[PDB]
């Protein structure tokens, strides 16, 4: 017996694709077909049991949950706040403490417009009350929102200004700016750094990736540094600031193109953009995009830059595995091939695009899982989003909804054969 198999994934049995117990609201297909996902539309899966999609200037949310014979999931329609420099679902995040098929019990929202005004919902389903908070931004384009513990949020600008917005049990919304950087070579970084304010000689590079490591860690990958905070319910303390602007650049350049003898002349041209900051059993992995525009055609080389996060801090050891995924690229407006690690203890890391998933490993970690491609080559099967829910890697698909890949129906490895080889390699004969 085998479990329900996707058509394009039918050949793939090493991992089994199963309906999570949740499929997308019908309003979602209609919105997507009216404004295609190859246009910039941003969807997110929440491990607390939710999913949302932002399109044009609208957001749509619906519960997601694992099911025995289906479950009930609420669907709601929301307006993205006006004054959008560009619309995205990343300005909206939830601090959900729930994980059930009734996971709507611990929901709080903060959203920001690209002017620094923030709208707070005590609950999505308490329609009739808003909280307006003037964050420190005057008209600055807010970029990201990171839900951290304490039901609090980290508002992020395009220049990576971080402000923890803290709900009150009364109903006011608190703005406390996160300190920016301490470095090891730059100037003063203990002075508060915020736009519409004074300037300090600290690193303020644009925010590339974030990861609320559930080991009390808030990691922010940038193009120049990884910043690690501990963000307790009411407190923030930047434990680490690793200046990665140089080091990983030379390591990735050597990992991809280190053979040539014109390294010094060519290195001026390589731009290495560290796409994502994920975490697996070995530690933090720094998904990097390295390419040289001086050599054509443009080939984006991805390198898994793993740094051993011990739960809080990443070791000074770095392992850069140059890893390629096909010559072809898909797009929704940007060149995309994104790596997601659904859990912080699972070896499998899933690259994904509009047409295929690739479950693989860094190649330098403490263990490994088979490198397998799960295709979804069809119309209406484009991957709208990816994430984790209830311990299993889930993907939001255009006209199919929430589908998870479960590691099962894969071959095993035996240790007796290698011992047999050791036994047989010895002893000789002559006559």
């Amino acid at each position: 017996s085998r479990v329900y198999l996707h058509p394009a994934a039918s050949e793939t049995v090493n991992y089994n694709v199963q309906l999570f117990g949740s499929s997308l609201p019908v309003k979602v297909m209609e919105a997507l077909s009216n404004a295609s996902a190859d246009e910039p539309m941003a969807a997110c899966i929440h491990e607390g049991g939710w999913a949302w999609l932002a399109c044009n200037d609208r957001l749509i949310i619906w519960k997601i949950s694992h099911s025995s014979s289906a479950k009930l999931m609420v669907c709601k329609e929301l307006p993205l706040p006006l004054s959008d420099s560009e619309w995205s679902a990343d300005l909206v995040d939830i601090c959900a403490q729930t994980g059930d098929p009734a996971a709507a019990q611990s929901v709080a929202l903060m959203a920001a417009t690209p002017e620094g005004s923030s709208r707070y919902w005590p609950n999505i389903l308490h329609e009739g009350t808003y909280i307006e908070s003037y964050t420190e931004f005057g008209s600055s384009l807010c970029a990201f929102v990171t839900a951290v513990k304490g039901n609090s949020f980290i508002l992020s600008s395009e220049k990576n200004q971080l402000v923890r917005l803290t709900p009150d049990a009364s109903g006011k919304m608190n703005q406390r700016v996160l300190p920016q950087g301490q470095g090891m070579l730059s100037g003063i970084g203990r002075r508060v750094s915020t736009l519409f304010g004074i300037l300090s000689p600290a690193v303020e590079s644009t925010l590339c990736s974030v990861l609320w490591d559930k080991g009390d860690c808030f990691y922010t990958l940038t193009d120049s540094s990884i910043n690690k905070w501990d963000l307790d319910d009411t407190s923030e303390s930047q434990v680490l600031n690793w200046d990665m602007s140089r080091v990983l650049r030379e390591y990735i350049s050597d990992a991809i193109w280190g053979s040539e003898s014109d390294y010094d002349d060519i290195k001026a041209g390589i731009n290495i953009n560290y796409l994502s900051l994920n975490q697996n059993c070995d530690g933090l992995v720094i998904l990097s995009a390295a390419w040289h525009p001086g050599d054509n055609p443009c080939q984006i080389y991805y390198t898994l830059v793993t740094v051993k996060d011990e739960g809080y801090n990443i070791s000074d050891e770095i392992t850069v595995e140059v890893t390629q995924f096909n010559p072809v690229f898909q797009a929704r407006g940007m060149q995309l091939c994104q790596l997601v690690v659904p859990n912080f203890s699972s070896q499998a890391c899933y690259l994904y695009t509009q047409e295929m998933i690739f479950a693989c490993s860094t190649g330098t970690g403490r263990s490994t899982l088979p490198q397998e491609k799960i295709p979804f080559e069809a119309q209406g099967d484009n991957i709208v989003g990816a994430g984790s829910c209830e311990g299993w890697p889930v993907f939001f698909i255009r006209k199919s909804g929430m589908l998870t890949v479960v590691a099962r129906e894969t071959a095993s490895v035996l240790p007796e054969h290698m011992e047999e080889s050791l036994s047989s390699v010895s002893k000789s004969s002559r006559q």
């Binding site: 295609s36 609420v74 009739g128 009350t129 119309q379 909804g401």
Partner: protein, 1001 residues
């Protein structure tokens, strides 16, 4: 229609999108006043606002308009409607703009509904019916002062003078009043600034820092607004973010009274963070007292507080608020609330922390915190249906998706376009094509999913669970999108409440006593006094204990047990046997002493007989016989009432809910009576008459459980969406077969869903309304067609009549009659399958309809067998005897006459052997008429001819007594033998004493 303002809303505060509202016509009531059940509702999504005018009893043609105020999103609670003897004036306020629209009045669009119609044109026909002209009717909020985004206040009114007065929250914290000229002349739109003091005092305080006698502060920014007109002054009450209710005088342009309403509520500091938009204010002006009431919702993330204040006027033309009541409320955030002064009743719609959206109502004057009688919403889509590898998911998934109240036709369509992929839309489909599309698209996904070389039970159940779960959860998410609330509306005059969800509008209906008791949990039952539950406090306590036992039995019964009862009941089994089996199951599984508590509560009862008889008397509406039946409207101006598509929808939803609840009540009551029987009837007060009463009622409970099983099943048994002419042709084929009850009835199929109950109601019930109307108008309410319809009593009486016509112990055969007239033979087949094993009367009718479907299928022998059982009760079942006696009596024996008519029927069916057999059966009755004897014998002769048994025909001829018929059949014989070249027959016939007949011939 898109309206273009020149300015848009101001950002920087609470949002203004996502609002809605409604206006109910005071002219509603009576067949001819200006309106009847007519009202208007609107939903504003930011810059779009949809207005639909709906009437409950009549369909309004072209009654929906979409107005796009593109620039400013419409403020929540900013749409107001006023009436003038010629036109309806619509006043709408937005963040930075104000609009006045003129609409034709219903009575000014002519008033006459003498003609008996089902649909009627609304007051919208073309673009000429709407207007947005006169930039004096629309005025721009001036830069001085403007309108702050940190508030949602907005109100409008027509002053007693006639001026259009628009109150907005001023940025300084006062009230900005846009004064548009009256409906008589058009000047320049004027501006007023209701501030702390007048112009003279403002000039006096202009050189000192005043915010109480000068220009106010943003802390006084009005959050909610209400207005009262007295003489020629407009007094404005403003709830603000500092919890000071502020009153401004329209002519005085100054603030008169500022009251700390926090004196009347528990002063929470969390009220202040809701002082922006969580606070609500409604105003209701009682004309019977000339007193306006302010209901104020001080929301708090802890708990909201409702407070009611009466306006009493002093001899200075100043009003004051007196605290009538303060009803405490939840922190569930209020979508809306209202309060009607025709009843002193407060209705409140909250959203809690689950899409089980919260609805209650309570009177302020009665309580100091209210008890808030609950309101039960439609069922949200269910979780678990059939677990793959543990159950075949597909059947349960289909059944749940087709379960009404938790799924919709739009959801089914759009999940079809899920499983069909593509960017095209799947919408506006017939019902049968819809279900076929559902099946086909799920099967297409299945076929793409399956590539297996070995097919297995678990693989099958799995592919089922993912495919049907995808479709099911898409429809579930859409139904949850539909479950989102928007607004609430109440109609005092004809007494119904409407709830605008996202898109659709639902209705709220009162329950019976028994169903209220059974659906309300134990806590709120104690909040209901013993006076209305039963006349006696003793009887009320007995019924309360009975309902508590029912509730504990229901909670102890799980879904697997429910499936067990369904399977065993569809299996041929008496309901009593299944009930006692399940009672034994509960006894065996009883470790919780839940039966011990049930027995204790049963012993707490002093006389369960009257409680059982009361629950069964609110049940028993049965009227045997059929002589009051009306299958068409008796044209007495009554046929203009009800019978519409919306009426059918609401009635069928009510029927579905009532049946779903009360069939379970039947099942639990039978189980509880069996449990009481096993406990013993010799240990209760009134034991002597208790013992025989329970034994008498147990078969009654069994039959009534079967009846409401049938009713609840019919409420969900679908009806095919097919055209009328095809069914007409099918009925014509039936009539060709010599079949009665093949009547053709013109009914209008709905473009959407059809159950067999919908079919029956739309086909028969509307036609029988005039007789129902003739009875009910006399019984209660106005007997005239202009009755102010009493809806709560009307629904109960309609339910009683429908139960009378659906009683299976009665000759009332109208449901199966409608099914056969509408050609639903499959539905009829499972109908008779479920009805026959326990059928009371008209078992012969069951065999009739069975065999009629059988003959339509073309099974001669077995269809005729069921005809034989039908003939076994033609003159012995009352409904069939209604259909006959046009076939009995007369010169011949009635049974012989029926023999002859069915002989003609078989000659219209075919198969001369069948005519042979019916003649052989009739030969026993044929001993009385020589004419019938000769006719049957000649038929035998002619059949002998047909299959060529010539000697046998000769013998049949020699049988014939009459010499005249002998000569006639001799001529037939000679002609046919000559044409068949069968000469030897003619000679070798050894005729004698017929020789001369043959010679002459």
């Amino acid at each position: 229609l898109s309206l273009r303002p020149d300015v848009s809303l101001v950002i920087g505060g609470p949002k203004y999108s996502d609002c809605a509202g409604g206006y109910c016509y005071n002219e509603s009531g009576s067949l001819l006043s200006a309106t009847r059940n007519r009202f208007i509702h609107w939903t504003s999504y930011a810059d779009t606002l949809e207005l639909v005018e709906l009437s409950l009893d009549i369909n309004l043609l072209n009654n929906a308009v979409r107005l796009k105020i593109l620039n400013c999103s419409i403020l929540p609670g900013g749409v107001h409607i006023c009436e003038t003897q010629n036109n309806i004036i619509v006043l709408i306020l937005t963040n930075q703009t104000v609009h006045r629209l003129i609409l034709p009045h219903p009575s000014r669009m002519y008033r006459s509904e003498i003609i008996s119609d089902s649909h009627i044109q609304s007051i919208f026909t073309d673009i000429g019916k709407t207007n947005f002209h006169d930039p004096n009717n629309t005025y721009v909020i001036p830069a001085i002062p403007g309108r702050a985004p940190n508030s949602t206040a907005s109100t409008a009114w027509l002053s007693s003078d006639g001026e259009a007065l628009f109150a907005l929250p001023s940025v300084s914290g006062g009230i900005l009043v846009i004064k548009m000229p009256p409906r008589d002349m058009e000047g320049l739109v004027t501006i007023a600034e209701l501030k702390q003091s007048s112009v003279m005092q403002r000039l006096l305080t202009g050189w000192m820092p005043s915010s109480i006698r000068g220009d106010p502060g943003p802390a006084h920014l009005p959050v909610s607004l209400a207005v009262h007109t007295l003489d020629h002054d407009s007094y404005l009450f403003a709830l603000c973010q500092d919890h000071k209710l502020r009153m401004w005088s329209y002519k005085d342009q100054m603030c008169l009274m500022v009251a700390d309403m926090l004196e009347y509520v528990p002063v929470s500091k969390d009220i202040r963070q809701t002082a922006g938009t969580g606070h609500k204010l409604r105003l209701a002006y009682s004309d019977t007292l000339e007193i306006l009431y302010l209901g104020v919702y001080l929301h708090t993330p802890r708990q909201g507080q409702f407070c009611v204040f009466q306006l009493v006027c002093t001899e200075s033309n100043r009003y004051s608020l007196e605290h009538t009541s303060s009803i405490f409320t939840n922190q569930e955030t209020l979508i809306d609330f209202t309060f009607t002064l025709s009843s002193m009743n407060i209705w409140a719609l909250w959203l809690d922390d689950d899409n089980q959206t919260v609805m209650k109502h309570i009177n302020f004057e009665r309580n100091q915190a209210g008890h808030w009688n609950p309101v039960f919403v439609n069922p949200l889509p269910d979780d678990d249906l059939a677990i793959g590898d543990e159950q075949e998911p597909q059947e349960a998934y289909l059944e749940c998706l087709f379960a009404p109240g938790r799924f919709t036709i739009a959801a089914l369509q759009k999940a079809i376009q899920i499983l069909r992929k593509g960017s095209g839309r799947v919408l506006d489909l017939s019902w049968e094509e819809l279900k076929k599309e559902v099946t086909l698209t799920v099967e297409k996904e299945i076929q793409n999913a399956v590539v297996d070389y070995d097919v297995s039970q678990e693989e099958f159940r799995q592919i089922n669970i993912e495919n049907w779960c995808k479709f099911y959860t898409c429809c579930l998410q859409y139904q949850e999108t539909l479950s989102r609330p928007l607004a609430l509306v109440v109609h005092p005059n004809t007494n119904m409440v409407c709830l605008l969800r996202k898109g659709f509008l639902s209705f709220l209906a009162p329950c019976s006593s028994v169903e209220h008791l059974y659906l309300v949990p134990g806590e709120h039952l104690l909040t209901v006094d013993e006076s209305v539950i039963c006349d006696d406090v003793d009887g009320a306590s007995d019924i309360v204990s009975l309902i508590q036992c029912l509730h504990m039995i229901a909670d102890y019964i799980t879904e697997d047990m429910a499936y067990q009862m369904e399977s065993a009941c569809c299996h041929p089994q008496s309901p009593e046997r299944v009930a006692e089996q399940i009672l034994e199951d509960l006894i065996a599984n009883d470790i919780d002493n839940i039966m011990e508590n049930i027995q204790n509560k049963l012993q707490d009862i002093r006389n369960p007989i009257q409680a059982i008889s009361f629950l069964l008397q609110n049940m028993d509406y049965e009227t045997n016989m059929d002589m009051e039946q009306s299958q068409h409207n008796v044209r007495l101006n009554l046929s203009t009432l009800y019978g519409s598509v919306t009426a059918s929808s609401v009635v069928c939803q009510a029927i579905y809910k009532i049946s779903a609840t009360r069939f379970l009540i039947c099942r639990d009551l039978l189980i509880l009576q069996h449990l009481l029987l096993r406990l013993g009837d010799m240990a209760l007060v009134g034991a002597g008459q208790l013992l025989h009463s329970q034994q008498e009622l147990i078969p009654r409970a069994a039959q009534l459980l079967l009846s409401y099983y049938m009713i609840r099943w019919g409420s969900q048994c679908l009806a095919c969406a097919v055209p009328v002419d095809l069914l007409e042709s099918n009925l014509q084929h039936l009539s060709v077969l010599e079949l009665s009850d093949s009547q053709v009835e013109k009914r209008r199929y709905t473009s959407g869903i059809q159950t067999i109950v919908e079919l029956f109601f739309e086909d028969v019930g509307r036609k029988h309304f005039p007789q129902v109307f003739a009875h009910l108008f006399i019984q209660s309410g106005s007997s005239q067609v202009h009755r102010s319809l009493n809806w709560a009593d009307l629904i109960h009486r309609i339910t009683s009549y429908l139960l009378q016509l659906l009683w299976p112990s009665n000759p009332n055969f109208q449901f199966a009659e409608c099914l056969m007239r509408n050609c639903q033979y499959t539905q009829l087949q499972e109908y008779v399958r479920l009805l026959l094993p326990w059928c009371q009367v008209n078992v012969g009718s069951c065999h009739f309809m069975l065999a009629q479907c059988y003959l339509v299928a073309g099974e001669g022998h077995k269809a005729l067998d069921c005809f034989s059982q039908a003939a076994s009760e033609v003159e012995r079942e009352d409904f069939l005897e209604k259909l006959i006696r046009v076939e009995e009596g007369e010169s011949v024996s009635p049974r012989l006459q029926y023999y002859n008519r069915v002989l003609r029927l078989l000659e219209d069916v075919g198969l001369p052997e069948l005519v042979i057999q019916l003649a052989t059966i009739a030969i026993s009755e044929a001993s009385d008429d020589w004419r019938s004897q000769a006719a049957l014998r000649t038929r035998i002769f002619k059949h002998h001819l047909d299959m060529g048994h010539n000697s046998q025909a000769y013998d049949a001829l020699t049988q014939i007594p009459d010499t005249s018929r002998q000569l006639d059949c001799l001529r037939q014989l000679v002609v046919v033998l000559c044409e068949r070249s069968q000469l030897q027959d003619l000679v070798e016939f050894p005729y004698v004493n017929l020789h001369n007949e043959v010679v002459g011939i």
